[PDB]
Amino acid sequence: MLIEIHMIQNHSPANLNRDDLGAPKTCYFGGVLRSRISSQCIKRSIRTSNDFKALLLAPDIALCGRTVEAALQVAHAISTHIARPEIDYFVAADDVPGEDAGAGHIGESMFASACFYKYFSIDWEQLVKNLKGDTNLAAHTVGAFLLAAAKTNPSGKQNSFAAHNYPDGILVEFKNSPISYANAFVRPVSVVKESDLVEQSIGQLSNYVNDIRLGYYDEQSPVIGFWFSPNNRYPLGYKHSKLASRNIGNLNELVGAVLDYIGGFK
Amino acid sequence: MLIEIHMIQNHSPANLNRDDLGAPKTCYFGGVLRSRISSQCIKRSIRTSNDFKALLGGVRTRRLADLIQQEAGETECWKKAQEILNKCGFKNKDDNTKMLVFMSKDKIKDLARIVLDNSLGLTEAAQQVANVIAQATLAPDIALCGRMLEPNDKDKDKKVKWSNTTVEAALQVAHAISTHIARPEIDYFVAADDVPGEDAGAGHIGESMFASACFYKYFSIDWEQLVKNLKGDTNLAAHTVGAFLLAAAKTNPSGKQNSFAAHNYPDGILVEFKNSPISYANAFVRPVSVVKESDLVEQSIGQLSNYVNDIRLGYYDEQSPVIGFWFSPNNRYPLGYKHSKLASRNIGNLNELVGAVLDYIGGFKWEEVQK
Amino acid sequence: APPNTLFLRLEGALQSWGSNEAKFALRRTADAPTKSGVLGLLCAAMGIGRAEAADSWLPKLANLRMGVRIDRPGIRWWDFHTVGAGQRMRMKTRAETLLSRREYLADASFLVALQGEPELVAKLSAALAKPVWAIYLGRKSCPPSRPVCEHPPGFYNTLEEALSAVPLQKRWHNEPLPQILPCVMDWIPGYDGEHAPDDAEIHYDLPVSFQPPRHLPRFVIRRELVVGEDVQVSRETGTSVWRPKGTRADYNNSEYKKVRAERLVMDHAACMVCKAPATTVQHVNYRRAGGKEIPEDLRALCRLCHDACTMLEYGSGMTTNRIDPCDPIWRERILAKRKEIVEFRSRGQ
Amino acid sequence: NRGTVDFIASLENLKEGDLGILRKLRGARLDEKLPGFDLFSALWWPLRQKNQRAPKREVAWLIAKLFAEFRFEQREGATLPILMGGICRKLEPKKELPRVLARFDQLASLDIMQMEEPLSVIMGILRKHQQVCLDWVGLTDVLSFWEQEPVKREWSDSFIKAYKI
RNA sequence: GUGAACCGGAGAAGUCAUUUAAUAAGGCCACUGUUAAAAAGUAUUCCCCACGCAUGUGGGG
Ligand SMILES: [Zn+2]
Question: Where on the tree of life does the source sit, at the highest rank (chain A) (predicted)?
Fold first, then answer.
């Protein structure tokens, strides 16, 4: 069996990932241009976090990489809407007066705000064979990664923009065949006065999950999923024949529920 | 330990920050256009304020030879100082080098001492000069903002290899986004001639741009990195924190303020002590509209309180409780008329807020640390 | 007629089937799924390791005949990629940064037909129903967005009819479709035409091992298909862009016509504000209207108080919530509206 | 869109007394000056009962107030961007055109609740050049679906097409 | 377990300084909401409960 985490996270205007020219990294989807965060950036920011390291054959070598093959799988963070890069015109100042009101430096930097969709995958069999039959430590490191990935962000240009946002929707599912839900945002999300950017993204995710539940995923095997938003801020498919098996309003409760499903450990 | 300050501030019609074309700076947040104030503008306006004057111990200049001459008095050493500055990989373009140099103002006397005497040779003195600029980091503004300096390599003296000349920032400042939609406005101005003539025309005709908005400001201070930046000076670090709070609360950017004079105070300050930084900028993903039953600032504060409640209830951890203070002048604006529980202490005086912040930080008193 | 071929749907947001000409820090890609790549995907789905693949599995599966039809060509997108930034790198060690530039395919979809032994296809499909390991599209940062085990196996004769069998699935209704779909298929000798035509080109994706990776060339030809004649355009599933529910409105409805009667009974046929005999009922808390009507949030009202409350709601804001009597607030404004209605409304209308 | 047609026709059928009543209520709410509330309720309520569709209340109120202030003969084929482009083409191309174009482009940024004065300046510029017609039905239909991106796209494209020729 | 696996482009910064949209103006001119009317009414008051030859009294809505 396989565990899959889908994540919706809006960010304040910043530049969390750059390239050789300073522009935010982008990609192409749905016929339009979307903002992107490269997968290795997310994996590095998760791995080298001090709070993560102070929390938990080594558990990081078992989960991540160094034939030791990692059970972790981080996909590129596509955006659920058309990218909107912007230029900020900065001017440096001199504290010493001169013959004119010169600057000292003149230039332009780039920034962009986006609502990213993140996909994660953990192979339970590879994880338990990596630690030679141990299960409690496997559940412990799964929970540690869940808290870390829920409470971390890249450090790119964070001394000037400080985009320390938090996720607004998490969906943890158990199934065999790996399918991601990037096809939900093939149509880019366009805002309306009666909703938010996060609300419409979560609703479109719910619509895609409903459509695929009515389709391929027959009664061969049930699919167990858990949906989390802080203090039940956003519902994924209100009623809708219980598209999500649970609705959670605290990170600890979701971590405990996933742990109790995977092994019943606490 | 991190000290994070979230502020709500409604401004009068003004143009406190603008781009190359004169228009006020805007950004796209949540799919909606909001007004913006750049973080470097706020940082400079706090740094060069009157309430921070006792802590300004660093200069970011391009003309260092001019300072060398002005601190050496009357003995002519300006060409010599320019030459030694060129030898350590700085270049020279008509009395101003090609790069800005960040260095504490206390060390100009040492540079004058090395440049005055002819007892030492040239090139070795250049190396010595480097050893003064790589160690001139004991300033509050350098400690807060942070410095990085990479000199040239095509005109170095090959014996002037540099030490580590970087300082990690101890203060993170965000871009002040607006809580509602952007409403840019054009002011059509004319400029008349004091002397009558034949026609009725005026001297000049133009248009300026201005906008009024409610801004959400976010600041974060790392206490451990701050006291490491000043080498264990906890007293001076607390003095910097208190003076920074006073200056940030009581100062506005000086952009077009002789024509607009938007000297507006904040209507709400929330100061939290945490271990990991959290931004409440997602409180206004949905823009704030106006209802007749309330006003813009009260609605913004209510939205902020609702999102703070959501964040606290959805990310509660018994291992790290969070202690926060809410400040409004004479308790004019509480944290929403629905909870009365997200504010551990309600403060109506700014000085009492600063004193409580300092007492939580280290148990010091304000008047002890002001000197 | 047992099935003899297996179909693979390879479609994801990002894809990268690397080419032979990389050999360096310029990680390139091919325009179509290579044979060695899909073979490695199959071996990963069957739980066979790299060392175990080179003995029997790859020689067994190298006898199949493979053809790839292009559904969406995609766009080649590059990515600046640094390694060892702020950390040392292997070989002793060095404090240095490694620069590289990777290439991916974005918004692309391919159909792979792999004709072979019926037992091989059956076992392969059974393994692909529940893969042993996570299967990605070339690189580990490229998970598929559609199920690989989607199209059923079958029995056909040529690769062209096999690629004709599966319909082309359409995205959103406005989206146009490619008119000529290129197919890239393995050259078949037939033991009579022993020499390939001059248009046949060599690709270098016939694998032997994976840990000391070894490849051999193969002759590959490229033909085309016409959509509609060869592949029928499939219809999109029932879906839409998510819009917030705008509710409904219906009073003629008998259930509401009886809910209002229950309300007028329960508040004893009297107004809440002026305590006059009731006329209608105001529908506070407009959420759950039409099908989930609970006779609790409704509040009975007379004509003047209802008109005053509608005047207050039409002015100011208006959302899913309403203005609720029995609130100590809004009483003064309701009384002022009552005064204005009494002293200003003309019945001649 | 028959409900919008009935709304506009009923607006043209109005006498001068209630037209003055609406004229006195420019820039105001709906909760004060009861004759305005009664007149608007008489105008708008029968549309919902017969016709399943009906224009939005805020859009209808704005259209009624704008019609009261800026009485124009309703004529098919006289949309606001086309007339604005025709006016803009016969302008000085250096100073007046950027100003008037900025005043026009301000409109496609707000919501319905704040379009009154930015529309009233446009109707004032129209009345300055002595217009005698305006497509109230098309303007109402466009204002109804003002949150759809192709609506604004066609608005701007029609303006540019009328400007260029 | 795929020309694959292990895999940050990061560190620094105020677009600033100056200004009246001024000068002229009438919405004017013409008009009947008119025509008809008692606040009166006894032949079964719309309902609960104690006695009676009364051809009804008492209390409750
Ligand atoms: Zn009443």
Answer: Bacteria
Check the annotation: does C305 bind a ligand.
Answer: yes
What's the rounded Cα separation, in Å, for the pair B2 and B357? 12
Cβ of residue B166 lies below 7 Å from strand E: yes
> Around Cβ A197, how many Cβ atoms within 10 Å?
25
CB of C15 nearer than 7 A to strand E: no
Sign of the alpha-carbon torsion through C27, C32, C36, C38: positive
Sign of CA dihedral C290, C294, C299, C301: positive
CA dist C111 and C115 (Å) reads: 13
Residue with tokens 């490849």: C215
- Do A145 and B159 contact (CB within 8 A), yes or no? no
Backbone angles phi and psi of D133, in degrees to 5: -150, 155
Q: If DSSP states are collapsed to H, E and C, what string results for A224-264?
A: EEEEECHHHCCCCCCCCCCCCCCEECCHHHHHHHHHHHHCC
What is the distance between the alpha carbons of residues B93 and A197, in angstroms, rounded to a whole number?
50
Q: Which chains touch B (3 or more CB pairs under 8 A)?
A: A, C, D
C-beta neighbour count of C125 within 10 angstroms: 15
Alpha carbon dihedral A108, A110, A111, A117, in 10-degree steps, equals 180
**Helical (H) or strand (E) element with B355:** helix B350-362
Q: Is C326 annotated as a binding residue?
A: no
Tokens of C91: 């070989």
The alpha carbon dihedral of C306, C311, C314, C317 has a sign of: negative
User: Whole-angstrom Cα distance, residue B219 to residue B271?
Assistant: 10
Q: Nearest-CA distance from A195 to chain B in Å?
A: 7
Nearest Cα of chain D lies from the Cα of C334 at a distance, in angstroms, of: 11
Phi, psi of C51 (to 5 degrees): -65, -40
d(CA D114, CA D118): 8
CB contact set of C163 (below 8 Å; sequence gap of 6+): C67, C69, C111, C113, C183, C225, C230, C231
Q: Rg for chain A (alpha carbons), in Å?
A: 21
CA atoms within 13 A on the CB side of B27: 28
Rounded CA-CA distance D32/D72 in Å is 27
Bases in strand E with any atom closer than 7 Å to a protein CB: 1-23
Tokens of A37: 């965060």
Minimum Cα–Cα distance from C135: chain A residue: A178
Query: How far apart are the C-alpha atoms of A142 and B216, rounded to whole Å?
Result: 36
Amino acid at B291: V
Q: Token pair 């959509």 is at which residue?
A: C227
Structure tokens, B126: 């250049």
Chain A residues with beta carbon closer than 8 angstroms to that of B62: 94, 96, 104
Q: Distance (Å, rounded) from C-alpha A189 to C-alpha A185?
A: 7
Give CA torsion, residues A15, A19, A23, A26, to 10 deg. Answer: -90
Q: Other C-beta atoms within 10 Å of B53: how many?
A: 10
Strand (E) positions, B65-108?
101-104
Which residues of B have a CB under 8 Å from any CB of C? 289, 291-293
Q: Coil, strand or helix: which one is A119?
A: strand
Dist. CA A210–CA A243, nearest whole Å: 7
Within 8 A of C317 by CB-CB distance, chain B residues are 289, 291-293
Whether residue A146 contacts residue A258, with contact meaning beta carbons closer than 8 Å, is answered with yes
**Do residues B310 and B286 touch, judged by C-beta distance below 8 A?**
no
> D67 is written with which tokens?
């019609």
Contact A179, C145 (CB under 8 A): yes
Beta bridge partners of B10: B214
**Measured between alpha carbons, how far is C239 from C247 in angstroms, rounded to an integer?**
19
Structure method? cryo-EM
**D99 to B292: CB separation less than 8 angstroms, yes or no:** no
Nearest C-alpha neighbor of A7 from the set A114, A144, A167? A167
Amino acid of residue C246: G
